[PDB]
Design an enzyme around this catalytic site. Structure first.
Site, PDB file in Angstrom:
ATOM      1  N   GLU A  11       0.827  -1.316  -0.128  1.00  0.00           N
ATOM      2  CA  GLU A  11      -0.004   0.045  -0.055  1.00  0.00           C
ATOM      3  C   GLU A  11       0.915   1.340  -0.036  1.00  0.00           C
ATOM      4  O   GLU A  11       0.321   2.217  -0.334  1.00  0.00           O
ATOM      5  CB  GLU A  11      -0.905   0.027   1.079  1.00  0.00           C
ATOM      6  CG  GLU A  11      -1.838  -0.982   1.142  1.00  0.00           C
ATOM      7  CD  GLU A  11      -3.070  -0.882  -0.049  1.00  0.00           C
ATOM      8  OE1 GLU A  11      -3.092   0.069  -0.830  1.00  0.00           O
ATOM      9  OE2 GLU A  11      -3.632  -1.736  -0.218  1.00  0.00           O
ATOM     10  N   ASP A  20      -5.692   6.476  -5.476  1.00  0.00           N
ATOM     11  CA  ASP A  20      -5.181   5.354  -5.254  1.00  0.00           C
ATOM     12  C   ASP A  20      -5.051   4.559  -6.845  1.00  0.00           C
ATOM     13  O   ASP A  20      -5.251   5.417  -7.856  1.00  0.00           O
ATOM     14  CB  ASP A  20      -5.911   4.261  -4.464  1.00  0.00           C
ATOM     15  CG  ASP A  20      -7.285   4.000  -4.881  1.00  0.00           C
ATOM     16  OD1 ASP A  20      -7.668   4.296  -6.052  1.00  0.00           O
ATOM     17  OD2 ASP A  20      -7.940   3.377  -4.113  1.00  0.00           O
TER      18      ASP A  20
END
Ligand code: JZ3
EC number: 3.2.1.17
Length: 162
Positions: A11, A20
């Protein structure tokens, strides 16, 4: 290696609102803020999540606080899911991390298209499961990450995380 180090690798850590891989406003260690294209909506979610006016920026401690919460909630979500719980409970600890990683990234609604993989995982047909896992939007959109998680499901080792 453990679930925190694993997801931290997958992440990353960013202290200001970013988009993202799906284009959605996110902060910290993959803490999804909103799917809304409105940055102000994301900033509101951020302030709500942190409990102060952040103006789109948080500290590392605050990132790690949300991360702890997010990991915990992923696990607790798996455990409340009638379809996911028996598979998850059948797995050893390393493969359980792969399952948490997948849910963390794609949510339970996401892991719902994975009926066939889930059955193979439950059956411990690891190479078959891994083949089936890769036949997915998941794998094609995030192949380097999915290969790591799939290797983790296939082997029950942390080989893919070095
Ligand atoms: C398909 O991988 C999983 C197995 C068990 C629970 C959650 C998962 O995402």
């Amino acid at each position: 290696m453990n679930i925190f180090e694993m997801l931290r690798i997958d992440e990353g850590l960013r202290l200001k609102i970013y988009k993202d891989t799906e284009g959605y406003y996110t902060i910290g260690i993959g803490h999804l803020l909103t799917k809304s294209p409105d940055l102000n909506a994301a900033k509101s979610e951020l302030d709500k999540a942190i409990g102060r006016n952040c103006n789109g920026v948080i500290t590392k401690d605050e990132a790690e606080k949300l991360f702890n919460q997010d990991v915990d909630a992923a696990v607790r979500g798996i455990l409340r899911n009638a379809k996911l719980k028996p598979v998850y409970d059948s797995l050893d600890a390393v493969r359980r991390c792969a399952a948490i990683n997948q849910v963390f990234q794609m949510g339970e609604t996401g892991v719902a298209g994975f009926t066939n993989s889930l059955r193979m995982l439950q059956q411990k047909r690891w190479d078959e499961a891994a083949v089936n896992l890769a036949k997915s939007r998941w794998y094609n959109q995030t192949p380097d990450r999915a290969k790591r998680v799939i290797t983790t499901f296939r082997t029950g080792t942390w080989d893919a995380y070095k």
